[PDB]
Design a protein around this nucleic acid. Structure first.
Lengths: 333, 100, 423, 28, 640, 49
RNA sequence: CAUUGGUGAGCAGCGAAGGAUUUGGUGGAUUACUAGCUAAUAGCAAUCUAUUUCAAAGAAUUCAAACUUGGGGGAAUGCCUUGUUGA
């Protein structure tokens, strides 16, 4: 089917799901293929869960958690119809948000469903996580985004965002901005701390099908078979707003910084490869990495994520993270 | 240098910006009308940028006993076994025989 | 095509990048001299010290190598990497690697070459990146433990599958393996390009020129049946034969001579092609050894062609060329040789050319006919040429002398050709 | 073993082309 | 020759006739415009399906073709027709009485060139139009300037200039004004082709001996020359992937690829198109790819590719030979016998006089295949023996099929020419079937038939005998003798009951078949030339010799109708599917439709080109006929 | 048009020796190190236990 | 005497410049042919951007919302619903 990308947080492995049953987990630099599943129910999305050693895929109805080789570990019963997956990785919480319109946080380390929240506004159309904060922004068919937390039945804050449903949201690494895109051909840059919209683009030529904020504040938007990238749109100055054209050599408009139209495809999702400067687009007939010469950050840290991480370093390190997992209950705003 | 010269091609005056395909010829963001000679020179360079210039056109032209001769006649002839000569002597190890 | 196969070709692309500490010990422990564990314990600075010492030794033996000390063996070459460099830069690094492998292909029975090229192996991964030039350089040592080593490290390209079977073994590759390598065709194209480059940069020697000779010979022998294979292998060997002649080393010229001889006795080539063979051969002939070999070769080629036009004159230019290169006393002592190669067809072609282009050395003609035992139709052709010469010229004493020589031998043929023309 | 000769699926990448319909022009 | 029942539809099984095809990029992708006599067809160059077909048949044959983005220009007898998506969008009549040879379009101008050396120029009314229509001027070539015109070219970056390559020199015109700005020095040969290179300034001219001259026009001097000795050059194309290659296509079928950087000859391709029907008439490298498309007047179109090298670094010294990607085709020679295979009117067998039996498709013209002749391993444990250099079976002159056992044993019988047995063919596997059916008295098979149930195949000979063979087992069962002269038609009832045979002694003999009695013997006037039986109603029609059709009721065993009115011999004919009409085509170039109730002619078409087979479809939508010249099958509808 | 991207050298991030511990680079951007006080509270509570 | 079981050495017969098994790769067919891309009444296809923004229009269930659960007992603390105290 049309595909769906997920680069492992570390940077190395990649996971592609189809839409028919074809899931595969690979290494992409050494080319070596970790696992491959030809399950025939329509998969929607996938994530890695903590290592390359575990992944979790949506399916037709349930959630299935597989090994590093695709031997099925678990059949998550209580996550019924999860069109969206995410993993918030200091707290170890697998998060699904449905088509039911229920939001479930599940601790994959002890095996015990932490919270089961009711988002009442209908089937969840988009979902992203504040990484600096670990709080789930779910975007809902009213046109309103809503910030949740596991230890609160009520949404922490509701944010009236678009007119008509919310196609896709994506949050900065610094935890301070949120770009959201909406089916009324719209795109809005919100300043999450202080909760004011910075600045908003109100007529795109066709709906913003996806967005993603890179590891350097750079913005990628995808509108059908087009991928557009604006640099420095996540500033407060009014002189930043993403225009598509410079009205005759005007150095205040922000014309795009890169662009690529695929011809016959229709881009499904997109992510940035973490520590190299590429972004991976997943579309109807495969995967592509576009080389984007500003994109990722150069110089990572090694006490959090090496991309050169050996086997012993992996297994020592993961028991250290398990031993220090933050409680589910911390997560404030 | 060439061997002909075109009086109207120099005296003509052509627009550019009227067509997407050729807006990219300009050097300024001011010029809109160029004369024929500069239009033709821009256009030649774009042809170069479409189909890059090789060695065979440019670097090489055709201009006692020689040295090149074995290679030259090999280039000329295409089927090098002598057959056409009424050989008078029946060649060995491969017979040519037809059943009646 | 499958995800598995596209991933496989990805790994082949990124085949030399150390992405892990495990992979880096795999790559770094492949090495020409040491065993695995020792090689993987030591580091680039040590290998460079050993290599610089060895290249100073090789510069002593052969003085071309100081340029490589300027440009591939510096402290900067400790620092450089091969994968972090744009494609223009990689192309230049492969030019320098190819020129190094030429200019020390000839020393591969020497521990200094072992040490210096071991630095090239480890810092620049020639055993992954340019293996075809590695193998075509060091090919002819195919018994020396050095080639067994080089096979043991290398990963074999698509045109060397015969050795792909023989890799990692205590027995060496064998002669019939080398012949079957060459008996495939696209390898003959490849090897020809390597020899053109080798000639043009002037690094040839008897050992490898013998080896390439023996393989081109053996390819023609195995293809001696399939006339389509032979006819399609004509242009490649005859291109090499021409270029290898146009060189100036007597060893090159002897190799080209033996290639021409074997190929023309295995396939009947056209008259114009044997003529141009002679043209190139003579026109760059100088040395003494080549002079003797070239004489034997031209006699053998003309003996091969047979049909009509069998025994005609050389054209003017080729005849004059042959006279410049070869004295009549030289061809006379060649006919005075003991072994006496069969050379009748060339001798009578030469004789008809003399009597139609020089009209003076008829005493020499009688000398030649005294020396060699021609055949009946050669007699008929020569005698008719002399008849026409008599009817165009003054009846000269030497022309008479030739006539009474034939009167001494075969009055009756003189009568028969006379009945053809005269009384 | 001999050399393997197996054909791989050819797919038509695109390339640019010039234009006559710019190449001609108009008097004044 | 307007008719009242049948109307013409299209002509299946033609691909090219030898006019050089034209190509057209459309975006990122390519199409191929070929012309078949009085039509042009347009093929997806990537996979070669039939996209479009010219809408109405042009008045004469098409002389020249050229294409551009969405438009395609055909220059027939006098005029130029601009078509988009097949349908005619502009006519453009050239003010003369002489045919249009060549045609080149560049920018604002369309340039047509007649045969009496004149060049007509048509200019767009405003460059927001999409194809030109104003007459501009008329440039002429006087005999002192050049010979006859051979081609029209427009090199890149040449403003308002036109390169006219004549038979002795090359001219340069400034087509806006029209002053002959340049003449080249006279070539000592005849120029035969010309084609512009993807380097600047340079046109590659192919002479009549093997000599390709790369000629630089800005300087006006030759820069290279390339000698093939003893060939007639007929195509030139410049590979533009980035590897500097050339394909010279001779007029003997050789296609010779040169490497122009290294001055080498890469390859030859030998007999890719036939020496007789023209050789290689066009051979082009698609702009940007390692793909060459060649097309020749033997009704075939081919595509060859270049695989990349085997060698990593050495690269472009080891060049792989170019192999064969894909192709379509039809018969080379006109067809000989046609027969509908199946009762949805899908597939049509047709044997043709280059000995080849195609099976055509009426729905999708990529499903059509040639039925191969690769024999089976003899069943005896022996050796089948023929000349080791293989050649196609003799021309297939009778042919009868049944679809009742398809898949389990063979179900076509074919009867070849001057040959003494029949061959069972297959139709599921599309291949020669494993049995050959003798006649057993030295007599050339004159006609064949198959039972309804598909078990038995009758093979009437030319010394009277009838032999009947099982088809599952190929094994001989029965053999009657009643005729003494040739036996020209066999038939059997759908109840496997009554057999009819008609033979040149003017006898129609009726047999029982379950048991083996002889049930009757009818005697006519003249020899009997063909039998068509019609099964559901038990009636059959014998084309006699005295230029008459005689319809006989095969149960009551007597002559029921006698259709006079023809005037020369009757070639072929066919009952309707519903038993009501006869279509019969006869050698005075007529086709008549007869009604059998009223016993009389109700329609007739007079044809410019004699019809030689006539066959309804079984599901009675169409009539397929085939003609004496021209490779195809002409398909007709049914207003009834 | 100065296109420059990230070129990490493997020989910078993994040692060519075999007996040398693979180096750790560091970067103190608090954006890279997210949950300060919750992470340290759990190290305090682990230490108490 | 069989063998309807192997493994071989041989004929008759078939028999045109050879034959017989096995296997890799690509192309075409497998449904009934109306061409490529885009922001689409048109342009592009050598290029979408130095007109690509404006104006207008556009905001119910003031929260219908898991029709989505294997069976049996339960539920500290959660969650949920109904009441309630103080702001």
């Amino acid at each position: 089917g049309p595909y769906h990308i997920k680069y492992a947080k570390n940077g190395t492995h990649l996971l592609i799901t189809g839409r028919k049953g074809h899931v595969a987990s690979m290494d992409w630099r050494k080319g070596q293929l970790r696992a491959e599943l030809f399950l025939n129910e329509t998969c929607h999305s996938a994530t890695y869960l903590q290592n390359e050693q575990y992944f979790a895929v949506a399916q037709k109805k349930y959630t299935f958690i597989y090994d590093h080789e695709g031997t099925e570990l678990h059949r998550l019963k209580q996550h019924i119809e999860a069109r969206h997956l995410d993993f918030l990785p200091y707290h170890y919480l697998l998060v699904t948000a449905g088509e039911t319109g229920w939001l479930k946080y599940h601790d994959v380390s002890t095996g015990q469903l932490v919270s089961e929240l009711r988002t009442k506004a209908g089937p969840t159309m988009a979902m992203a996580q504040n990484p600096w904060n670990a709080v789930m922004h779910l975007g809902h068919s009213n046109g309103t985004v809503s910030l949740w937390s596991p230890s609160m039945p009520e949404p922490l804050v509701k944010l009236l965002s678009a007119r008509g449903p919310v196609n896709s949201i994506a949050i900065d690494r610094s935890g301070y901005y949120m770009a959201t895109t909406g089916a009324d051909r719209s795109m809005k840059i919100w300043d999450i701390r202080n909760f004011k919209q910075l600045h908003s683009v109100e007529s795109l030529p066709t709906p913003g099908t996806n967005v993603s904020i890179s590891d350097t504040g750079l913005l990628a938007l995808s509108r059908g078979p087009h991928v557009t990238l604006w640099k420095d749109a996540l500033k407060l100055s009014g002189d930043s707003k993403p225009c598509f054209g410079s009205m005759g050599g005007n150095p205040h408009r922000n014309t795009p910084y890169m662009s690529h139209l695929f011809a016959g495809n229709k881009v499904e999702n997109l992510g940035f490869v973490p520590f190299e400067d590429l972004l991976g687009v997943g579309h109807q007939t495969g995967i592509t990495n576009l080389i984007v010469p500003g994109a990722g950050e150069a110089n990572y840290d090694a006490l959090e994520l090496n991309p050169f991480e050996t086997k012993k370093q992996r297994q020592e390190q993961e028991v250290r993270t398990l031993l220090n997992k933050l409680p589910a209950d911390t997560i404030t705003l | 240098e060439a061997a002909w010269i075109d009086s109207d091609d120099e005296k003509i005056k052509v627009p550019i910006l009227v067509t997407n395909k050729t807006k990219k010829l300009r050097t300024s963001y001011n010029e809109s009308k160029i004369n024929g000679v500069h239009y033709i020179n821009r256009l030649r360079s774009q042809f170069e940028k479409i189909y890059p210039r090789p060695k065979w056109v440019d670097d090489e032209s055709d201009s006692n006993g020689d040295i090149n001769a074995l290679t030259k006649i090999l280039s000329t002839t295409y089927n090098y076994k002598d057959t056409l000569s009424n050989s008078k002597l029946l060649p060995p190890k491969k017979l040519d025989i037809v059943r009646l | 095509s499958s995800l598995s196969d596209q991933l496989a070709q990805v790994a082949s692309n990124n085949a030399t990048v150390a992405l892990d500490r495990k992979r880096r010990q795999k790559l770094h422990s492949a090495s020409l001299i040491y065993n695995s564990k020792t090689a993987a314990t030591q580091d680039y600075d040590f290998i460079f010290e050993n290599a610089s010492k060895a290249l100073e030794e090789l510069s002593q033996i052969e003085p071309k190598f100081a340029i490589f000390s300027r440009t591939l063996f510096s402290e900067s070459s400790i620092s450089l990497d091969r994968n972090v460099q744009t494609k223009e830069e990689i192309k230049d690094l492969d030019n320098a690697i190819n020129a190094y492998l030429l200019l020390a292909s000839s020393k591969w029975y020497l521990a200094p070459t072992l040490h210096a090229t071991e630095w090239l192996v480890r810092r620049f991964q020639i055993h992954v990146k340019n293996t075809e030039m590695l193998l075509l350089s060091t090919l002819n040592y195919y018994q020396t433990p050095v080639f067994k080593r080089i096979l043991s490290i290398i990963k074999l390209p698509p045109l060397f599958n015969c050795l792909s079977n023989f890799v990692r073994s205590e027995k060496p590759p064998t002669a019939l393996t080398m012949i079957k390598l060459f008996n495939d065709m696209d390898f003959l194209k490849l090897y020809t390009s390597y020899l053109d480059q080798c000639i043009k940069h002037n690094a040839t020697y008897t050992n490898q020129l013998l080896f390439t000779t023996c393989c081109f010979i053996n390819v023609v022998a195995f293809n001696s049946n399939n006339d389509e294979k032979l006819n399609q292998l004509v242009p490649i060997l005859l291109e090499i034969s021409a270029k290898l002649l146009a060189s100036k080393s007597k060893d090159c010229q002897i190799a080209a001579h033996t290639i021409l001889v074997v190929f023309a006795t295995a396939l009947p080539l056209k008259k114009t092609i044997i003529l141009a063979a002679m043209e190139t051969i003579l026109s760059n002939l100088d040395a003494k050894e080549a002079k003797h070999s070239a004489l034997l070769t031209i006699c053998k080629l003309f003996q091969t062609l047979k049909g009509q036009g069998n025994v005609d004159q050389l054209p003017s230019k080729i005849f004059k060329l042959f006279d410049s290169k070869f004295d009549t006393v030289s061809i006379l002592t060649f006919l005075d040789k003991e072994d006496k190669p069969v050379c009748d067809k060339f001798i009578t072609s030469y004789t008809r050319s003399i009597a139609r282009y020089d009209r003076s050395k008829l005493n020499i003609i009688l000398s030649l006919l005294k020396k060699i035992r021609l055949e009946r139709y050669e007699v008929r052709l020569i005698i008719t040429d002399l008849i026409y010469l008599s009817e165009i010229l003054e009846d000269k004493s030497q022309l008479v002398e030739l006539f009474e020589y034939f009167i001494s031998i075969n009055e009756d043929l003189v009568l028969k050709c006379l009945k053809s023309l005269g009384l | 073993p001999k050399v393997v000769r197996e054909a791989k699926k050819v797919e038509m990448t695109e390339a640019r082309a010039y234009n006559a319909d710019a190449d001609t022009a108009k008097a004044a | 020759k307007n008719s009242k029942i049948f109307s013409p539809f299209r002509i299946i099984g033609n691909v090219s006739n030898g006019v050089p095809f034209a190509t057209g990029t459309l975006g990122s992708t390519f199409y191929i415009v070929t012309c078949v006599g009085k039509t042009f067809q347009i093929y997806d160059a990537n996979t070669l399906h039939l996209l479009f077909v010219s809408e109405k048949e042009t008045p004469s044959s098409i002389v020249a073709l050229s294409a551009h983005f969405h438009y395609v220009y055909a220059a027939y007898e006098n005029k130029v027709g601009i078509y988009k998506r097949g349908i005619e969008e502009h006519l453009l009549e050239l003010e003369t009485d002489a045919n249009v040879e060549h045609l080149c379009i560049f920018g604002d101008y369309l340039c047509a060139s007649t045969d009496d050396n004149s060049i007509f120029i048509y200019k767009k009314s405003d460059p927001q139009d999409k194809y030109p229509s104003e007459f501009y001027t008329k440039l002429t070539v006087t005999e002192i300037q050049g010979g006859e015109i051979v081609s029209l070219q427009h090199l890149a970056t040449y403003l308002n200039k036109l390169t006219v390559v004549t038979k002795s020199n090359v001219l340069l015109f400034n087509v806006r004004t029209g002053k002959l700005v340049f003449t080249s020095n006279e070539f000592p040969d005849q120029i035969t082709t010309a084609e512009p290179a993807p380097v600047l300034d340079i046109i590659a001219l192919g002479t009549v001996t093997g000599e390709v001259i790369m000629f630089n026009m800005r300087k006006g001097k030759r820069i290279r020359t390339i000698k093939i000795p003893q060939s007639r050059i007929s195509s030139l194309s410049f590979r533009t992937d980035g590897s500097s290659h050339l394909s010279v296509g001779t007029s003997s079928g050789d296609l010779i690829f040169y490497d122009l950087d290294r001055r080498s000859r890469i390859h030859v391709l030998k007999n890719i198109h036939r020496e007789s029907y023209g050789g290689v008439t066009q051979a082009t490298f698609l702009n940007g790819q390692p793909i060459i498309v060649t097309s020749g007047g033997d009704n075939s179109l081919k595509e060859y590719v270049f695989d990349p090298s085997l060698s990593q670094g050495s690269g472009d010294v080891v060049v792989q030979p170019p192999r064969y990607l894909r192709s379509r085709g039809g018969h080379s020679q006109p067809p000989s016998y046609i027969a509908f295979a199946d009762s949805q009117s899908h597939f049509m067998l047709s044997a043709s006089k280059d000995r080849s039996l195609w099976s055509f498709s009426l729905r999708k013209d990529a499903q059509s295949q040639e039925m191969s002749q690769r024999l089976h391993k003899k069943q005896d444990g022996g050796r089948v023996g023929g000349s080791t250099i293989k050649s196609k079976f003799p021309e297939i002159v009778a042919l009868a099929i049944e679809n009742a056992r398809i898949g389990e044993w063979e179900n076509i019988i074919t009867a070849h020419k001057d040959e003494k047995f029949a061959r069972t063919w297959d139709m599921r596997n599309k291949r020669v079937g494993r049995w050959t059916f003798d006649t057993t008295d030295d007599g050339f098979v004159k006609s064949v038939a198959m039972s309804q149930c598909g078990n038995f195949g009758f093979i009437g000979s030319s010394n009277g005998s009838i032999t009947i063979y099982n088809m599952q087992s190929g094994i001989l069962r029965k053999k009657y003798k009643l005729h003494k002269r040739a036996v020209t038609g066999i038939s059997l009832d759908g109840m496997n009951r009554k057999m009819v045979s008609c033979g040149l002694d003017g006898i129609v003999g009726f047999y029982d078949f379950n048991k083996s009695t002889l049930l009757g013997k009818l005697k006519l006037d003249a020899p009997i030339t063909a039998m068509v039986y019609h099964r559901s109603s038990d009636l059959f029609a014998l084309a006699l010799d005295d230029l008459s059709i005689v319809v006989i009721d095969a149960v009551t065993q007597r002559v029921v109708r006698q259709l006079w009115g023809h005037s020369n011999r009757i070639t072929a004919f066919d009952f309707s599917p519903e038993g009501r009409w006869i279509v019969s085509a006869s050698l005075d170039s007529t086709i008549r439709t007869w009604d059998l109730p009223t016993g009389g002619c109700i329609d007739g078409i007079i044809v410019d080109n004699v019809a030689t087979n006539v066959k309804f479809s079984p599901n009675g939508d169409l009539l397929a006929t085939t003609h004496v010249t021209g490779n195809g099958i002409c398909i007709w509808t049914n207003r009834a | 048009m100065k296109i420059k991207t990230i070129k990490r050298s493997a020989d910078d991030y993994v040692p060519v020796k075999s007996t040398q511990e693979s180096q750790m680079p560091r970067n103190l951007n608090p954006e890279l190190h997210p949950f300060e006080r919750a992470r340290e509270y759990t190290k305090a509570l682990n230490a108490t236990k």
